[PDB]
Amino acid sequence: MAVPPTYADLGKSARDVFTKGYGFGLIKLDLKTKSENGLEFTSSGSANTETTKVNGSLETKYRWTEYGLTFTEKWNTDNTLGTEITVEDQLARGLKLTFDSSFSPNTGKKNAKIKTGYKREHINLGCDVDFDIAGPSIRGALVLGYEGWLAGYQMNFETSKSRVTQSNFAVGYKTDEFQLHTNVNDGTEFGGSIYQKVNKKLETAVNLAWTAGNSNTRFGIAAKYQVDPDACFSAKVNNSSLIGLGYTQTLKPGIKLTLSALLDGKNVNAGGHKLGLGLEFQA
C-alpha cells in the first residue's frame, strides 16, 4: 500500500489493458486449479495457427503456507524442466528468497538463479543473480515511494564483459484509479503510459514510445469494458494502424472462452487478419 511495486511492475496495469483478453494467431487451452495452500496445477497448450506448431506446459506448485514456502515444478514440450523454491516473510517481513534451477536435455544446458527481494513501507528492492556459463549476471532494482510518487532505477551487470549492459530509470504516480508511468531504457528508449479506472466497468490506457534520435513516435490507446459479470470486451488501436478486438465470455462457472481479432488498416477486411481462441478452465 505504502509499499511500492517491484521495478518490473511499474506500469503493469496499463500494460494489462493492452495484453489481457487478446491472443491473436493462437488456439490456447489452459487448465488451472486453485488452493490457498498445498497442491496447485496449471497446464497449458498452444497451437500457433501460422506455424502448425503445438506447445505444451505443466506447472505443479506446493505451498507450505505455514513456513512461507512454495515449491514449484515446470516442464514444457521442448523437454525443458525446472524447479523453484521460494521463502517469503520468513527471516524478516517482507524478505523473499528464491532458488531456481533449469535443465534442458535437448542441449544438456542448465541454468541456476537466485532472486532476493526486500520490501517495506516506501521501498522495494531486488537483486537477481544469474549463474550462467557466460554469466554470472546480476540485476539490481530499487523503487522509492513518496505520497503516490514513485521513482525507480534498474541495472544489469554482465561479469564476462565486466560491464553494465542495462541502465533504466522510471518515474510515476500511482493511485487506485489512475497511474502515470514513464521510463527511459539506456538513455535511449523512452516510454510513457497513463492508466485510468474510469468507473466500475471501464479501464482505459494510453501508451507512448519513441527512441533517441529517430523523430518518429509510436502510440496506442486501449480499453477494457466489463459488460456484465460474465462478459468482457477489449478494444485497442495503435498508430501503425493495427486494431485489436477481444471478447471474453464465461460459458459456465469456471469456463471462459475468449475470441480475438487483429486487423490491419487500411485492409479491413480485405487481406489476411489474425484470429485467436482461448479457453480457460478453472477447477
Side-chain angles (χ1 to χ4, degrees), residues 1-160 162-283:
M1 18 65 169
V3 187
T6 187
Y7 186 98
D9 288 347
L10 296 167
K12 180 197 190 276
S13 285
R15 287 200 298 277
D16 287 359
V17 183
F18 289 88
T19 50
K20 263 60 158 304
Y22 301 106
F24 314 127
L26 303 164
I27 285 107
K28 257 177 296 143
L29 217 104
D30 291 273
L31 234 156
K32 299 107 166 265
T33 76
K34 74 263 175 164
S35 225
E36 235 142 84
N37 74 102
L39 223 105
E40 193 164 291
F41 91 68
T42 317
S43 95
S44 180
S46 210
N48 181 325
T49 77
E50 286 87 25
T51 70
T52 285
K53 164 195 291 129
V54 169
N55 303 315
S57 35
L58 179 67
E59 181 194 281
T60 284
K61 198 172 295 192
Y62 190 81
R63 319 194 192 259
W64 281 51
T65 214
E66 275 206 305
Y67 297 81
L69 278 166
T70 308
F71 315 73
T72 311
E73 241 127 315
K74 264 136 189 154
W75 181 88
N76 31 107
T77 34
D78 329 285
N79 293 124
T80 302
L81 219 134
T83 51
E84 198 197 38
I85 318 170
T86 289
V87 198
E88 200 169 11
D89 290 348
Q90 224 40 54
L91 214 58
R93 177 214 264 282
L95 187 64
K96 189 190 188 176
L97 301 295
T98 299
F99 179 54
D100 192 14
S101 312
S102 192
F103 288 78
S104 184
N106 285 15
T107 348
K109 60 143 275 161
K110 113 143 217 296
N111 183 73
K113 279 191 259 237
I114 291 151
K115 308 197 256 207
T116 73
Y118 181 65
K119 219 167 54 169
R120 66 149 43 230
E121 213 171 281
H122 313 311
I123 313 296
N124 197 320
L125 282 156
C127 182
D128 299 346
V129 188
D130 206 294
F131 300 103
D132 172 32
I133 236 59
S137 65
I138 309 161
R139 185 162 270 114
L142 159 65
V143 355
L144 303 169
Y146 174 69
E147 288 169 44
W149 292 91
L150 257 11
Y153 184 64
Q154 198 196 237
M155 59 64 175
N156 190 230
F157 184 88
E158 268 168 37
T159 58
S160 69
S162 223
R163 252 151 56 219
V164 174
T165 62
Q166 218 171 104
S167 184
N168 310 331
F169 289 99
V171 22
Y173 184 80
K174 162 160 172 170
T175 185
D176 258 348
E177 294 103 7
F178 171 81
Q179 294 176 35
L180 191 289
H181 167 74
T182 69
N183 65 265
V184 43
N185 306 345
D186 280 300
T188 273
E189 278 299 316
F190 306 77
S193 71
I194 299 183
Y195 166 83
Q196 311 177 244
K197 176 135 203 141
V198 178
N199 57 59
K200 194 52 170 205
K201 278 168 158 194
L202 176 63
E203 319 184 71
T204 69
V206 182
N207 193 270
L208 318 171
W210 66 86
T211 302
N214 179 314
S215 73
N216 311 315
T217 307
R218 301 143 257 143
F219 68 84
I221 320 318
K224 167 146 256 192
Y225 193 69
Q226 202 116 50
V227 201
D228 58 76
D230 278 4
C232 183
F233 187 64
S234 298
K236 64 176 171 185
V237 301
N238 75 18
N239 73 330
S240 300
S241 297
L242 301 181
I243 314 259
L245 296 161
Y247 207 87
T248 301
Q249 178 70 225
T250 330
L251 315 146
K252 301 288 166 181
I255 299 154
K256 295 183 198 159
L257 167 68
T258 137
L259 304 185
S260 45
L262 177 69
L263 319 166
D264 277 56
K266 21 263 184 176
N267 299 345
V268 171
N269 288 288
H273 281 333
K274 251 100 150 317
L275 294 182
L277 198 151
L279 202 56
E280 179 196 278
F281 191 111
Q282 175 99 38

